[PDB]
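cache lookup: miss for this entity combination. No prior model stored, computing from scratch. Input as submitted by user K.M.:
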Amino acid sequence: MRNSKVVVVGTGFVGMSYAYAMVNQGTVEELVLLDIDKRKAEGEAMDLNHGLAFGPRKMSIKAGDYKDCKDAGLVVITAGVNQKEGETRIHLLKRNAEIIKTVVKNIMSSGFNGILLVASNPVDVLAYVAWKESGLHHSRVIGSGTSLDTARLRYEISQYIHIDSRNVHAYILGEHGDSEFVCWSNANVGAKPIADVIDSMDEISFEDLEHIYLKVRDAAYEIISRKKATYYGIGMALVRITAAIFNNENRILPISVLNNGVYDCEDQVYIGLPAVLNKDGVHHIVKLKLNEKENSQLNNSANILRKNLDDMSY
Amino acid sequence: MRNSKVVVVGTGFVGMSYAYAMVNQGTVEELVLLDIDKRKAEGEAMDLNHGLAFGPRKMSIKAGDYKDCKDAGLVVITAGVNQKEGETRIHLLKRNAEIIKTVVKNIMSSGFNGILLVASNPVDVLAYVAWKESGLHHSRVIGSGTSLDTARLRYEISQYIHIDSRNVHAYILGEHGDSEFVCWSNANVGAKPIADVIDSMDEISFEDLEHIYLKVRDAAYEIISRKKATYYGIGMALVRITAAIFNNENRILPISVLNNGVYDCEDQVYIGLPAVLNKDGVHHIVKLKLNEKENSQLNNSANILRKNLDDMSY
Amino acid sequence: MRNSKVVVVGTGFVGMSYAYAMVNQGTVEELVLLDIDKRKAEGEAMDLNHGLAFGPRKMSIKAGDYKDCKDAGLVVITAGVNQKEGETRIHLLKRNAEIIKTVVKNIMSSGFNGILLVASNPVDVLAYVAWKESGLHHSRVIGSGTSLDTARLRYEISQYIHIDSRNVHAYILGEHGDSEFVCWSNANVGAKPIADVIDSMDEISFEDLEHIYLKVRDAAYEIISRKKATYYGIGMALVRITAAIFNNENRILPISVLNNGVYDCEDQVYIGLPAVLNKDGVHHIVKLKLNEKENSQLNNSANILRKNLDDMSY
Amino acid sequence: MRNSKVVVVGTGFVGMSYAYAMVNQGTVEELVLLDIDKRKAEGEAMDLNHGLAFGPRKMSIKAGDYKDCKDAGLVVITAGVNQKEGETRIHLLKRNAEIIKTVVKNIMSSGFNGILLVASNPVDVLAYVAWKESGLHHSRVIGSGTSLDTARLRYEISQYIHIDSRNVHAYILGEHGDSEFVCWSNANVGAKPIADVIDSMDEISFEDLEHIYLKVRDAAYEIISRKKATYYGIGMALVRITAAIFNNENRILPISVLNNGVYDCEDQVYIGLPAVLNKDGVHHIVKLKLNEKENSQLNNSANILRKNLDDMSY
Ligand SMILES: [Cl-]
Ligand SMILES: [Cl-]
Ligand SMILES: [Cl-]
Ligand SMILES: [Cl-]
Ligand SMILES: [Cl-]
Ligand SMILES: [Cl-]
Ligand SMILES: [Cl-]
Ligand SMILES: [Cl-]
Ligand code: NA
Ligand code: NA
Ligand code: NA
Ligand code: NA
């Protein structure tokens, strides 16, 4: 048995770029848009529906309510708030946790028993929050984690070596935020280790690697400073996560998942790690052999998230 | 010989929804984004590029300048301005005509010799302006016209009769604006005339038709009033027009084209009519047998646009 | 709830062209191949599986047994036999009916409760046979009927008027065989009636229509005489029927369906008529207004099939 | 500038499975089929054309002659002969070399200046022959090499570890034939080296690797013995090679290429190696660090092909 219904909670540019990308890719049959501003969600459903006669797939799209979650295979949460003038980061963190809690309680009230995908920032902490408040098994609750950071990394590398970015197999791990890091010890192009690529190609050197990490680190800021917000990138990352689940792919993607003893960092954190996705959610987390530097960086990143969660009394 | 490069002029939500939809559909290989705010166009190119590692097609995407138009197969113009406090409609009409003129002169300076597609509103008058200022043959300059209105119509009909909207073959003709009208005399579902569908199906009646026309008429307003602007719909319409040209389809779509004696309304207006699109642009305009009411409505619509153009001293 | 499993019974070139086309289009997730020659089905599954690492969709493909039908959403039957030296047409007709009966009993034994799609020839009579032997409701048993004849017709017309064949909306109706006929009274290009197209375009005349009918009539023979058998065409027709069902499209396609009083020809025959397909099978048969000639031709075609069925004591 | 025309020479099941797969994937716009049996090629073009009204892309498909190669971007050669009763392997090798020579001379006579892709067996020797007889630069002449063997390898590995085969990044190198070998030293799943996968997963062990190599070695025989010939697998491999070129991907695929000093085996052989493909053909061969065993195996494989070529007085 298979499901083909996704509910999107929050119709800001992240949720709607995701929805539009799904419409253009024909990812699923049925889409339901939820927003605290019901009129806005209705307008967004009109605007999506009006392009369908030109789209690749027959779809059913509507604005709905939490009761529409009941038989949804996936709910994607993008809701949250922005820092107010004078507001501390812990205060805001707590306001976003309360929003996620409320969304998740409303989703669970419907009878929903599918998978939760959190894209709201800070995504690692909010995925943990959603996991705890949902009562669901952690293999059924994920966050988008470093999937977009990873796509950025592949893009940047591809510009040095002029190889299809889809042939670049390297991950950003850890917190989706300032403490993320590149796993260079397990990076290849095609089947070829990155260290060998560096030795072979004049196009890419050791110095470029640190530059690329910085570019990946600064990418969100850079986009926000130029066009107010970033959303096309995450929209396609969320589509890809969705497709791995509905197409039952057993695809390896870096996403926010509960470590739970897989890596030797903090067990009780959601954090960006490569994981196998299929129709049932997370099949398992892939355990990479990290070098000493990367393991240290993963520990640092996990400690940071665990402190955040402690401070939110989670 | 084939081209696979599109330039988008103006990176507001219409131009960028179009670009993102192309990225998700893999419509063409190469995309160049132009905007008077160069930093903004650069941010938009970053945000699109970051989703490519998850996209269906290898692409080259960058922010560029008018010189990048030189070997573009298609330039899509979305630039323009909004009414200022106190501004007359003729004043604003003239300010938009001057913007189009300037864009088009800059495009032609590059050596460009491809096709122009105008999506800026009011699209029928601005397509005529672009045609005149470009010096190009009118088969190489088009506007998006009533292609989106037509998709809306198909969507609305599909909701009554519960048939795939892509099986609904009916057009909105005329001005993309208040004087557009439904061509009911040439409308079918599958191969079946709409009048026969009405007789057969309890699901749809003569009264529903006038309602559907009103819904189509009010659709933009409705969306704008709920989410500030409409853009997902036109984005997919522009993709479809683009695909008909780059895939050399000889596809019939209702778009803004120079009447030029095909219908018996004003010859010297661009107006929404069904037309055959292929790699060379407009192969010919399809001439439908209109009934007396529709012919009158087309004349009214053409007269309105011709008066607009006169008033702009075109 | 949605299904994504198809079983193919008979792995000759029709069944396997269908399967390969599905693999290349990514139509469904799961495919099971059945053949009385188990080793052959296993070889075909190997050969399909080996292309998947290059395919657009993750799939599960295997050779199986009738018990694999139990949770299949669709079983496509292509099994049957060829005329032996000296064999009468009624004898062979009866040998094919017994094969279909046996296949269908074996399918039903599994607990299967999905949709049956018969492609074996003569498809209209064998669809009726499959319907009767299955015990299923007639909306859940169909044949491929004149869907391919219809694609041929659209192709031929497109070559005269140089319009995308997918914009040509015209049907072949009746028996998939010598008594099929073109429904010219309900034929259009885009939204434009074919009679108007003829008047407008020097490219197509009344004389061409009879020629086109003859071409469509002779197409199978022509292909068989040049490459031994026809199978790429039907393979893509079967994919399209499958996609209408699994994508729940409410798509109108001409297929073999039980008339049952919809048209005024024989009620108890399966015959090629336009029908609405969705995830539940046939939603309804579309009733076209036929002209006097076409109605007569449909009656002739139905009488022929009814005589065939009588002669088989169905 | 971009091309979108492919010519297929030889319409047996390899050439036609390739063509049909392209039609179902919409790989290119224009297809021309050539065969010494012109009637057969015409029948194959009919059978393909008849499915287009149901296909994803508008296409132009016809049977043609060598003059149609003139503006083709790619010619795919599948022509050749089978061993006769009593015939030595060197005799037959020479008969196939003469066929390739004749095809290639006829292609070059047209004015063709695109890329040659040889799929005829033995593909490595015949790619060299085509290269020499064509007068073209070796970056513009390739063979399908071990691309299919590689897809088989990925499929087999995926069945042990239950990961999307498209996440399995490992190559078969060398002769497409008995002396091919797995490059285990440069094999990963996602970004994770295969040795680490073996250590982590109970699902796959060192012993399985030798078994998998044997399965890959025996795959063609196995399929041939069950269904007479193998062709669906190579058909999709050829599509993938084609797509890398027409979509200008800079994609890494293992194909037959002229070693020419890249690896330290024989310089003057075509042999299966990973290579970067884009619109211009082979950008460069990727040089992997091979371990001692693999380097020896590559040398053995190259020596075998060089002896074959010597024996054919190439
Ligand atoms: Cl569903
Ligand atoms: Cl939001
Ligand atoms: Cl291009
Ligand atoms: Cl703008
Ligand atoms: Cl399923
Ligand atoms: Cl069979
Ligand atoms: Cl071309
Ligand atoms: Cl051949
Ligand atoms: Na280097
Ligand atoms: Na009615
Ligand atoms: Na005519
Ligand atoms: Na193991």
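stored under new cache key. The radius of gyration of chain B is 19 Å.
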